[PDB]
Design a protein around this ligand. Structure first.
Ligand SMILES: C[C@H](CCC(=O)NCCC[N+](C)(C)CCCS(=O)(=O)[O-])[C@H]1CC[C@H]2[C@@H]3[C@H](O)C[C@@H]4C[C@H](O)CC[C@]4(C)[C@H]3C[C@H](O)[C@@]12C
Ligand SMILES: C[C@H](CCC(=O)NCCC[N+](C)(C)CCCS(=O)(=O)[O-])[C@H]1CC[C@H]2[C@@H]3[C@H](O)C[C@@H]4C[C@H](O)CC[C@]4(C)[C@H]3C[C@H](O)[C@]12C
Ligand SMILES: C[C@H](CCC(=O)NCCC[N+](C)(C)CCCS(=O)(=O)[O-])[C@H]1CC[C@H]2[C@@H]3[C@H](O)C[C@@H]4C[C@H](O)CC[C@]4(C)[C@H]3C[C@H](O)[C@]12C
Lengths: 281, 297
């Protein structure tokens, strides 16, 4: 046993991190418990940011963000307890049934933008948003995974789980491909825009069998919207997928956008020590 | 079974609704009106297909796959064509994707992983012996029948450019680097057999480990790991399995183990039982078939 949590099967076991299924004995909620090497994260250059973002994600409750229930530590380990959802991955709808209708795409896009924008407002940037982070609960609501956790060092992100993405480079903004540092908000917004493209088209905007030509297209944002895209959706997508992060549209501008505001009901919800986030207890 | 006057018709197949749509290709359900068989039909713009410098290789590989019947290869039953479309008539399977097991239960036991690997290696080597190279092996091509037997998809079709093939179902233009051999990433993957073998080794790794041998959120680090074949086998891998995987994941295709040598590897041969199974006009593969249509619709 571990905490108020009863353990189930091992989901993955990487070298410095591992993930177990569990349930909360007090309420029966499904969770996953990630156990990671403590010194690997303590030694890391960006530890103060890690501590800050993780401490923040503990506090955040947004209806469209995966909950981080607990964060505890041993002398050698850090434990994370994360909400486990049962509706699968959002992109499964495309694998099984092709592109989504515009209204269903816009709905998920609204949940996504609001959740991402909310985390940004609390100083937390994903920086590696991929379709595999777009999960669905029993009722079909979007739950975005890995905010905060994505800030951990690579060797601890290798946690024994299968992580592949169809069309990986598509979701990474040109400035993230090419540069060491970058703006987190603009990098996340690029990812969201590609996600929206795929939901509405059923296929990736950037492709080429030739890798040099593929990355050339990404850096110029050379892509083509299919004919079923509306004029207003195409125009918003082209502003989001601006290959220059200096001129790329802002989240605030996306939220004010006429296409975006269609059927848009901002969700009503409420959300009302850092250095000691990983010490023993 | 009944021909349905209000449905589209090609050969003995009646076409149903569109499942997926790409720019040049669509996928529809269809059914054989003679015997009730349900199939999937990929319909692709004919001019787009023909106007390619690789059309000869495409006709050859599609012609071969149409004739192949392997227990671990998805069947291509028929190819028909109109003036403007090519119809590839393909087998459905019900068991989903192989990696679904992993994605839910993590790694498989050594014996079960070795079983799927034997199935994969046999099918791929079989197609190689007939001159067909896949070159695009990835999780999306590893399907399962109701018996839970592996069925490899896209042999033959993978010869088409991914952009022409793209059907709006998230598999054709994936181009995921994690499954791709370093020489192929480097635009020098001449030996198609060694390139497919690398992918198969990455697949074996995932089944036994539950995760990818090369992964990184940083694209530069990812490609670097691939070119150097920098990876670590988990501690539960046996000495023999580790020995084989390291021979497969050799980033020099020249020194990389061959398909034939894998088949004779002592670990691969464990419980191994090769399949017991059977067994122009190539140029005309895509000619207008003159198949009856339904003129109502
Ligand atoms: C030029 C860009 C970006 C490289 C980069 O920037 N990598 C380091 C960034 C991250 N760091 C934090 C480590 C920065 C280091 C600190 S510093 O600030 O000092 O940079 C990189 C990103 C991925 C690279 C691919 C591989 O080459 C080879 C590959 C196959 C063929 O062969 C050619 C094509 C292809 C697809 C290439 C495309 C791309 O065009 C390259 C060159
Ligand atoms: C990959 C799967 C979704 C796909 C899926 O399918 N999940 C299992 C169910 C399989 N089924 C039994 C339903 C299929 C058979 C039924 S059938 O009727 O089809 O036969 C999803 C669902 C829950 C997700 C985890 C949790 O969020 C907690 C945690 C959050 C972190 O941030 C990232 C890590 C971690 C461990 C997440 C990883 C991953 O993202 C999980 C496993
Ligand atoms: C993504 C799914 C597997 C996962 C899944 O979703 N499994 C649910 C099974 C449900 N059914 C049994 C009713 C059949 C599917 C109905 S569905 O709702 O999925 O349309 C797999 C299993 C069968 C696969 C197709 C066939 O190989 C024929 C053809 C081969 C070409 O090379 C590539 C194109 C095509 C159309 C393939 C596309 C895709 O790769 C399919 C749908």
């Amino acid at each position: 046993r571990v905490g108020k949590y009863e353990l189930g099967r091992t989901l993955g076991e990487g070298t410095f991190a591992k993930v177990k299924f569990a349930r909360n004995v007090e309420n029966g909620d499904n969770v996953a418990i990630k156990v990671i090497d403590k010194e690997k994260v303590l030694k890391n250059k960006m530890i103060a940011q890690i501590k800050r973002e993780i401490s923040t994600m503990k506090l955040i409750k947004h209806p469209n963000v995966i909950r981080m229930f607990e964060v505890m530590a041993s002398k050698t380990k850090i434990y994370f307890v994360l909400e486990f959802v049962t509706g699968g991955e959002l992109f499964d709808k495309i694998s099984s049934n092709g592109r989504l209708k515009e209204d269903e795409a816009r709905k998920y896009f609204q949940q996504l933008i609001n959740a991402v924008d909310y985390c940004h407002s609390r100083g937390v940037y994903h920086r590696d948003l991929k379709p595999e982070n777009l999960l669905l609960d029993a009722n079909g609501a979007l739950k975005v995974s890995d905010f905060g956790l994505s800030a951990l060092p690579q060797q601890v992100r290798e946690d024994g789980l299968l992580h592949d993405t169809c069309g990986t480079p598509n979701y990474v903004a040109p400035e993230v491909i090419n540069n060491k540092g970058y703006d987190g908000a603009k990098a996340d917004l690029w990812s969201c825009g590609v996600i929206l493209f795929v939901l509405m088209a059923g296929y990736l905007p950037f492709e080429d069998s030739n890798l040099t030509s593929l990355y050339k297209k990404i850096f110029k944002a050379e892509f083509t919207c299919p004919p079923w895209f509306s004029a207003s959706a195409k125009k918003l997508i082209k502003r989001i997928l601006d290959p220059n992060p200096a001129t790329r549209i802002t989240f605030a501008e996306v939220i004010e956008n006429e296409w975006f505001k269609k059927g848009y009901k901002a969700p009503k919800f409420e959300n009302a020590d850092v250095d000691a986030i990983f010490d023993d207890s």
